[PDB]
Write a protein that binds this ligand. Structure first.
Ligand SMILES: *[C@@H]1O[C@H](CO)[C@@H](O)[C@H](O)[C@H]1NC(C)=O
Length: 332
């Protein structure tokens, strides 16, 4: 079909960046591809923080096709511990040789100096891939606009994450058994804002910690760590502690620690210790954090390095003839 591939680079932390061209003649940026948001942000030459001067900065004055917005302004977003601010504009984008004209985006003009998250990462922008309901500026999100202008591309994208060999890639318009084995298990999206599906049960080893009431998983490629709500996290940290992981005993800990099982009807997503434990300098720490999502507080995030390396994930946008779905398959 019209399927095409966008190579992905893992820099540090977890977030995955790909090549995006902006403007005429094209300027190159390497934004995060984020299923947890919907806007496009691009770091520009108006940002004079040192955390901005160190990265590639888009210059809107060098783009023939850039049109600054007169009526939309003062776009501001919290960015983890940090925050970004800027203005609104429109330009032509290119992703994997596919053109996207008249695309509205945020121009970063200021990054917080809070430690300071922008010092730990190499941030050049964000391509949001969530649903239209989270769009802040402009009247059409990036992926929606690309599909409108490339109508033979099927409305879906998938992430193949293989950081051990630099072979990670974002696939648009379809899927391939080059990246997965077994069946694809389709999970219906319940609410079209985040890619959010029903979670039936969650086990830590043999201990069921969920669910007696409707609960949710959000597939968020912009998060590094998987999450649990407050109550389950107290259970988790009583069951799973940081531990010495030296050359002598780390394989022992990876075999011994419990498997975490997410149950979605027939699909069981299993995370082994090698997935959710982070080895750093002779110590293993569990890669889970406490996140409580308002309406909710029954939402669990699944994101990047730990989970997506072992599971090929397919994001199927609903159309006039099908609902939105998340497909999960065993990676490789
Ligand atoms: C871009 O915008 C101009 C003016 O608003 C319009 O005439 C043109 O058709 C648009 N192009 C696309 C591909 O939407």
């Amino acid at each position: 079909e019209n399927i095409f591939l966008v190579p992905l680079k893992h820099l540090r932390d977890s977030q995955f960046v790909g090549e995006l061209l902006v403007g005429t003649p094209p300027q190159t940026v390497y934004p995060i591809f984020d299923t947890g948001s919907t806007n496009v942000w691009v770091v520009t030459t108006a940002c004079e923080e040192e955390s901005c001067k160190k990265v590639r900065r888009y210059d809107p004055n060098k783009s023939k096709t850039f049109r600054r917005s007169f009526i939309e302004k003062n776009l501001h977003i919290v960015f983890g511990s940090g925050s970004i601010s800027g203005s609104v504009g429109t330009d032509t984008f290119m992703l994997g040789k596919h053109l996207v004209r008249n695309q509205t985006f945020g121009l970063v003009e200021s990054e917080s100096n809070n430690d300071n998250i922008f010092d730990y990462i190499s941030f050049e922008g964000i391509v949001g891939l969530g649903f239209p309901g989270m769009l802040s500026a402009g009247n059409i999100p990036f992926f929606d606009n690309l599909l409108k202008q490339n109508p033979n591309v099927d409305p879906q994208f998938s992430f193949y994450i293989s950081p051990y060999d630099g072979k990670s890639t974002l696939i648009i318009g379809g899927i391939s058994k080059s990246f997965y084995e077994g069946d694809i298990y389709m999970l219906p999206v319940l609410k079209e804002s985040y890619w959010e599906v029903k979670l039936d049960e969650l086990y830590i080893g043999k201990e069921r910690i969920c669910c007696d009431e409707e609960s949710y998983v959000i597939f968020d490629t912009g998060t590094s760590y998987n999450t649990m709500p407050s109550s389950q996290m107290k259970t988790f940290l009583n069951l799973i502690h940081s531990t010495a992981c030296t050359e002598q005993n780390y394989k022992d800990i990876l075999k011994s620690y419990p498997i975490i099982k997410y149950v979605f009807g027939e699909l069981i997503i299993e995370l082994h210790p090698e997935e959710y434990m982070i080895l750093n300098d002779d110590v293993c720490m569990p890669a889970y954090m406490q996140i409580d999502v308002p309406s909710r507080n029954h939402a669990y995030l699944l994101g990047s390095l730990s989970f997506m390396r072992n599971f090929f994930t397919v994001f199927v946008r609903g159309t006039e003839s099908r609902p939105s779905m998340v497909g999960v398959a065993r990676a490789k």
